[PDB]
Amino acid sequence: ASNFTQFVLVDNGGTGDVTVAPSNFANGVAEWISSNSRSQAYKVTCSVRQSSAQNRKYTIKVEVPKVATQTVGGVELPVAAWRSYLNMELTIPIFATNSDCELIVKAMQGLLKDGNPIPSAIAANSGIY
Amino acid sequence: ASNFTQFVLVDNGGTGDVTVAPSNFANGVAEWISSNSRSQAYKVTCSVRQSSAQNRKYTIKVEVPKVATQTVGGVELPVAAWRSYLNMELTIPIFATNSDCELIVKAMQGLLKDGNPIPSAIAANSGIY
Amino acid sequence: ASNFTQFVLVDNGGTGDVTVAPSNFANGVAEWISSNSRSQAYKVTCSVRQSSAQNRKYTIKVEVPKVATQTVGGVELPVAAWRSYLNMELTIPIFATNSDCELIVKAMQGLLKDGNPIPSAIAANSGIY
Amino acid sequence: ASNFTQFVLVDNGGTGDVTVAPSNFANGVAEWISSNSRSQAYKVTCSVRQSSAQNRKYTIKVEVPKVATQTVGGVELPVAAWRSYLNMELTIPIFATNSDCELIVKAMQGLLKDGNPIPSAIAANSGIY
Amino acid sequence: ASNFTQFVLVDNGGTGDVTVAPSNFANGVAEWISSNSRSQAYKVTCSVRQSSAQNRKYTIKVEVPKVATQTVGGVELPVAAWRSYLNMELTIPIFATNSDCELIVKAMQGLLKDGNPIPSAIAANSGIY
Amino acid sequence: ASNFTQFVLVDNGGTGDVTVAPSNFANGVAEWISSNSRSQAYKVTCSVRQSSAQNRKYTIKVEVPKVATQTVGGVELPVAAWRSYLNMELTIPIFATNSDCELIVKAMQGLLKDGNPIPSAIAANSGIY
RNA sequence: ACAUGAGGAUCACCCAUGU
RNA sequence: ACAUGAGGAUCACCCAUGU
RNA sequence: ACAUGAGGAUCACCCAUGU
RNA sequence: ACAUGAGGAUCACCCAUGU
Numbered sequence: 001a002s003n004f005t006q007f008v009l010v011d012n013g014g015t016g017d018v019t020v021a022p023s024n025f026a027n028g029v030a031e032w033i034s035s036n037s038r039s040q041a042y043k044v045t046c047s048v049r050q051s052s053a054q055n056r057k058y059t060i061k062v063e064v065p066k067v068a069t070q071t072v073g074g075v076e077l078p079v080a081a082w083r084s085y086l087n088m089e090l091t092i093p094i095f096a097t098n099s100d101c102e103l104i105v106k107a108m109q110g111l112l113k114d115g116n117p118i119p120s121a122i123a124a125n126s127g128i129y
Numbered sequence: 130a131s132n133f134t135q136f137v138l139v140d141n142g143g144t145g146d147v148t149v150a151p152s153n154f155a156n157g158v159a160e161w162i163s164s165n166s167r168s169q170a171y172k173v174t175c176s177v178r179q180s181s182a183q184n185r186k187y188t189i190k191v192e193v194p195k196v197a198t199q200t201v202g203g204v205e206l207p208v209a210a211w212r213s214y215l216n217m218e219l220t221i222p223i224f225a226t227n228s229d230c231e232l233i234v235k236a237m238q239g240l241l242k243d244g245n246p247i248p249s250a251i252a253a254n255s256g257i258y
Numbered sequence: 259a260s261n262f263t264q265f266v267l268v269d270n271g272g273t274g275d276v277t278v279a280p281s282n283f284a285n286g287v288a289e290w291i292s293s294n295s296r297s298q299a300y301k302v303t304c305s306v307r308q309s310s311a312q313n314r315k316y317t318i319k320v321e322v323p324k325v326a327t328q329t330v331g332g333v334e335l336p337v338a339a340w341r342s343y344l345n346m347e348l349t350i351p352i353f354a355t356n357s358d359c360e361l362i363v364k365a366m367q368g369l370l371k372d373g374n375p376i377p378s379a380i381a382a383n384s385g386i387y
Numbered sequence: 388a389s390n391f392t393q394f395v396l397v398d399n400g401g402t403g404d405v406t407v408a409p410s411n412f413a414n415g416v417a418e419w420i421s422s423n424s425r426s427q428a429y430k431v432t433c434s435v436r437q438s439s440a441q442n443r444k445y446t447i448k449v450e451v452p453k454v455a456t457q458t459v460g461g462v463e464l465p466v467a468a469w470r471s472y473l474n475m476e477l478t479i480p481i482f483a484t485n486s487d488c489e490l491i492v493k494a495m496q497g498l499l500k501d502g503n504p505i506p507s508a509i510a511a512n513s514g515i516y
Numbered sequence: 517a518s519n520f521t522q523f524v525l526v527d528n529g530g531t532g533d534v535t536v537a538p539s540n541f542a543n544g545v546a547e548w549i550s551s552n553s554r555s556q557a558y559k560v561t562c563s564v565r566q567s568s569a570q571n572r573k574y575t576i577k578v579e580v581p582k583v584a585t586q587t588v589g590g591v592e593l594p595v596a597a598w599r600s601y602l603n604m605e606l607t608i609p610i611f612a613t614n615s616d617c618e619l620i621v622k623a624m625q626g627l628l629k630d631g632n633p634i635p636s637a638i639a640a641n642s643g644i645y
Numbered sequence: 646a647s648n649f650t651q652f653v654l655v656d657n658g659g660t661g662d663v664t665v666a667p668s669n670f671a672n673g674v675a676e677w678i679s680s681n682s683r684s685q686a687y688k689v690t691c692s693v694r695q696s697s698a699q700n701r702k703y704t705i706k707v708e709v710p711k712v713a714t715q716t717v718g719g720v721e722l723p724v725a726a727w728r729s730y731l732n733m734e735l736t737i738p739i740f741a742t743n744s745d746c747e748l749i750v751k752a753m754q755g756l757l758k759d760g761n762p763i764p765s766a767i768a769a770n771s772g773i774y
Numbered sequence: 775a776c777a778u779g780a781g782g783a784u785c786a787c788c789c790a791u792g793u
Numbered sequence: 794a795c796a797u798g799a800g801g802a803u804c805a806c807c808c809a810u811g812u
Numbered sequence: 813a814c815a816u817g818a819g820g821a822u823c824a825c826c827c828a829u830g831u
Numbered sequence: 832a833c834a835u836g837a838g839g840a841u842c843a844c845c846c847a848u849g850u
Contacts, residue, residue: 001258001260001262001264001279001280002260002262002774003246003249003250003258004257004258004283004774005246005774006517006774007244008239008245009236009239009240010232010235010236010239011235011239011242012235018236021517021769021771021772022544022771022772022774023564023771023774024544024564024565024772024818025257025283025284025543026543026544026563026565026818027285027543027805027837028256028284028285028837029837030246031805032246033771035614035769035770035771036613037611037612037613037770038611038612038770039610039611041770042236043804044240044247045804045805045837046246046247046257047256047284047805047837048250048255048257048282048284051796051837051838051839051840052795052839055839055840056254056296057839058247058250058251059837060240060247060837061804061805061837062236062237064229064236066222066224066225066229073715073716074714074715074716075713075715075724075726076713077611077726078611079611081224082183082222082224083222083803084219084220084221084222084233085218085220085804086217086218086220086233086236086237087217087219087804087805088215088216088217088218089214089215089216089217089837090213090214090215090216090251091213091214091215091839091840091842092213092251092254093211094295094296095195095210095211095297095335095336096195096213096295096296097294097295098252098253098254098293098294100195100213101251101253101254102252104193104215104252105241105248105252106139106141107138107139107171107193108191108215108248109140109241109242109243109248110136110137110138110140110147111138111173111191112234112238112241113140113238115136116136116137117132117133117136117159117175118173118175118187118189119234119237120132121132121175121177121187122219122221122230122233122234123227123231123234124227124230125185125221125225125227125230126132126177127157127176128132128154128159128175128177129130129132129133156799156843157799158799158843160843172842174799174842174843176799176843177799178799180799180800180801180802180833180834181801181833181834184801184802186799186801187799188843189799190799190842197333197334198333199331199333201331201332208333210333210334212841214840214842216843218799220801220802220804253279253293254281254291254295254296254299255280255281255282256282256283256284257282257283258280258281258282258283258288258289259516259537259538260516260538261504261507261508261511261513261515261516262504262515262516263504265503265504266497267494267497268493268494268497269493269496269497270493276494276497283515283541285542285543285786286543287542288504288514288515289786290504300494301785302498302505304505304508304515305514305542305786306508306513306540306542309776310776310777312467312468312555312595313467314554316508316509317786318498318505319785319786320494320495321785322490322491322494324480324487339482340480340482340483341480341785342477342478342479342480342483342487342491343476343478343785344476344477344478344491344495345476345477345478345785346473346474346475346476347473347474348471348472348473348509349471349473350471350509351453351467351468351469351470351555352553352554352555352595353468353553353555353589353590353591354453354455354512354553354554355453355552355553356511356551356552356553357454357455358453358454358471358553358589359510359512360510361454362451362473362510363501363506363509364396364397365397365405365429365451365473366449366473366499366506367398367499367501367506368394368395368396368398368405369396369447369449370492370495370496371395371398371496374395375390375391375392375394375419375433376431376433376447377495377496378390379390379433379435379445380445380477380479380488380491380492381485381488381492382388382485382488383483383485383488384388384390384435385415385434385435386390386391386433386434387388387390387415387417414780415780432780433780434780436780438781438782439782442782442783444780445780446780447780448780453591455553455589455590456587456590463591468591468593476780478783478785512549512552512553512554512557513539513540513549514539514540514541514542514547515540515541515542516520516538516539516540516541516546516547517765517769517774518774519762519766519771520762520774523755523761523762524758524761525751525752525755525756526751526752526755527751527754527755528751534752534755543818544772544774544818545818546762546773546774560756560763562762562763562766562773563773563818564766564771564818565818567821568820569803571820571821573818573820574763574766574767574818575818576756576763576818577818578753580748580749582738582741582742583745583748584741584742596699596700597740598738598740599738600735600736600737600738600741600745601735601736602733602734602735602753603733603734604731604732605730605732605733605818606729606730606731606732606767607729607732607821608729608767609711609728609729611711611726611727612727612729612770613770614768614769614770616711616729617767617768617769617770618768619709620709620731620767621757621764621767621768622655622656623655623663623687623707623709623731624707624731624764625656625758625759626653626654626655626656626663627654627705627707628753628754628757629656629754630754631652632652633648633649633650633652633675633691634689634691634705635750635754636648637648637691638703638735638737638749639743639746639749639750640648640746641741641743642648642693643673643675643692643693644648644675644691645648645649672824674824690824692824697815704824706823706824708823728822728823730823
């Protein structure tokens with residue numbers, strides 16, 4: 001068994017779907033990268049650690065690129081015009097049973113579901129109002 | 130119009146669903162809290178700001194409580210035995226059109242969808258393997 | 259294949275069996291824990307390192323908790339009254355054939371077979387005499 | 388009781404089984420060895436002592452010879468190329484009843500049971516994957 | 517995908533082919549070995565990492581045993597007289613698309629193709645003349 | 646004989662094949678480059694040195710360019726946008742027979758055969774997983 | 775860093791010693 | 794190194810303060 | 813000079829370490 | 832205050848370093 005597998009980061013139906021695959025697991029940091037030029041690839045990293053006697057802390061990171069071609073002196077290169085950086089840290093007391101962890105996961109999924117306040121503000125370059 | 134409304138943080142079908150409602154919007158930080166004792170409530174905060182000339186930064190936070198009764202000297206109080214803290218920061222260059230922001234949102238939803246590596250490791254008190 | 263699968267650590271004859279599942283492979287240390295709060299889980303860890311130019315050393319560690327519910331600060335938390343620690347290191351020469359290895363495995367199995375000296379002494383809180 | 392008796396270490400289903408028999412008790416340290424020279428013998432030693440005020444600790448040591456291409460009764464050097472060493476340290480808190488100790492013995496038998504990850508890795512000259 | 521599977525390393529046209537199979541993944545470093553003792557095994561290991569900000573680097577290592585006059589399962593010393601070591605470091609600029617990478621793989625297959633200078637020199641215990 | 650001949654480094658099936666021809670043997674380093682300006686050529690170098698009293702070490706180096714036309718100082722020059730570098734060192738004991746060597750060659754060929762793990766990971770800008 | 779310890783642990787940590 | 798910060802990044806880096 | 817490094821490179825060059 | 836950190840929290844606080 002492994003959970004260090006490729007998965008769909010961006011679901012665009014079934015065509016235009018962004019798939020991120022395992023690339024490296026050095027020093028406890030799992031990394032996934034989408035295919036083609038590393039310069040225009042999506043990247044996900046995830047590590048977990050005992051942050052204190054009572055807590056374990058997950059550090060999850062995602063990079064969404066703005067794909068573009070850079071032309072400098074007639075030599076063009078595939079680059080990312082720019083990138084968005086999602087950095088998230090989740091702390092969980094060592095007392096959490098498996099049911100507690102699941103509730104935590106639902107809370108995370110709910111916060112981001114379509115229609116809810118946060119994903120709507122972001123999807124529209126807005127804030128709360 | 131407003132997006133500062135109540136929403137379902139934890140969907141448990143249609144009964145056992147955790148709903149978080151607007152509570153305060155002081156100094157640009159939107160807060161939502163579930164009902165009943167504030168001591169055992171769920172909390173979501175979200176603020177957005179121009180972090181640099183090119184970027185706007187969202188700071189989203191969620192608190193999932195472990196509901197318990199504390200008894201001290203015969204006087205019981207509704208408390209949270211402990212809490213999980215989700216802290217996330219999302220940076221977006223000011224060049225992102227609305228389509229870019231949407232792609233960013235899908236990437237966030239995809240990372241957490243059921244079955245994918247990250248929500249599975251968390252839901253099971255595990256790491257990547 | 260992939261030998262990183264789950265298994266029953268304590269076989270209580272199909273009912274009350276303690277099964278341990280894969281949970282982390284960060285740093286080359288394969289970990290397996292049981293479904294519990296991490297404060298009350300059985301943990302099994304395994305790592306192999308080429309300890310010398312001509313040896314390989316496996317380091318296997320097992321933790322068996324005595325579960326309990328403790329009232330700290332007036333609140334109840336799932337905890338482990340105590341833990342028993344098994345620590346084994348096995349050093350095998352690089353010259354050992356697959357069958358040479360199969361012999362080490364049978365030797366460890368026989369050593370702990372019910373009814374033999376060592377497991378009898380242990381289960382009876384006794385020494386060998 | 389009297390548990391310091393002869394036992395089958397490597398069970399080959401009757402034909403070519405390896406029986407190890409009492410050979411030394413200097414210092415309360417029970418030793419068992421097979422019918423061979425000591426350079427080519429299967430050896431097992433076991434002792435218990437109270438490690439700390441809260442723990443008792445069993446120290447079990449097993450030596451297994453590299454058998455493929457072995458010359459019985461011969462002088463094989465370096466010793467290190469022809470022998471595998473197993474070292475087990477079992478720590479049991481003074482509170483552990485006999486029943487607690489029996490469960491621990493099961494946890495050890497389960498870890499080494501045929502078909503489980505750990506024994507299958509050792510036997511195949513592998514690690515966890 | 518899932519490319520960490522068993523493959524034929526030395527193709528002898530069916531009879532006496534050498535198949536190498538997954539044996540370790542500690543640290544994201546995939547390892548494959550043949551069915552032998554580790555002193556006489558065929559071994560392959562591979563890892564990728566981002567070497568500099570502009571490059572990614574694959575490190576592939578192969579170990580091949582001296583087979584002429586070999587005693588299977590035997591202890592053959594010095595180790596250095598009985599083993600050949602191959603070390604490959606492939607540096608690929610982050611701009612390289614998948615198609616660029618395919619061409620590179622061809623450049624490697626061509627270099628080692630039968631009848632070409634490099635493989636013919638190695639195989640004849642020679643240099644270039 | 647003379648193994649210092651030309652060969653097709655990138656076989657694009659008879660049309661668009663990159664052949665590399667012998668170009669220098671100064672300093673015991675056999676060099677081969679493709680027909681191009683030296684700024685845009687594929688280069689292959691090979692040297693063998695008796696690295697130890699009992700070893701011989703082959704050092705093979707391959708360079709695959711990403712060709713481009715760059716406008717420097719208002720003028721157009723044939724250039725290489727970037728280069729991918731392969732670096733391999735093979736160490737063989739002086740005790741290796743011609744057939745022992747032929748085995749190392751087949752092992753390197755199998756390693757890179759289309760469809761096997763390593764060349765699949767590389768061509769897909771991926772890691773082994 | 776190794777190495778060995780019927781050295782310790784709250785257990786992927788600490789000790790002491792021979793290199 | 795710990796910890797926190799609606800501190801910053803080019804994103805497993807960097808900055809400030811309370812152990 | 814060797815030696816080893818899932819050390820780096822602009823790649824027949826540089827690094828660090830055990831001799 | 833900016834910035835970063837698989838730095839910490841009791842979580843819009845606190846810590847370190849590069850402006």
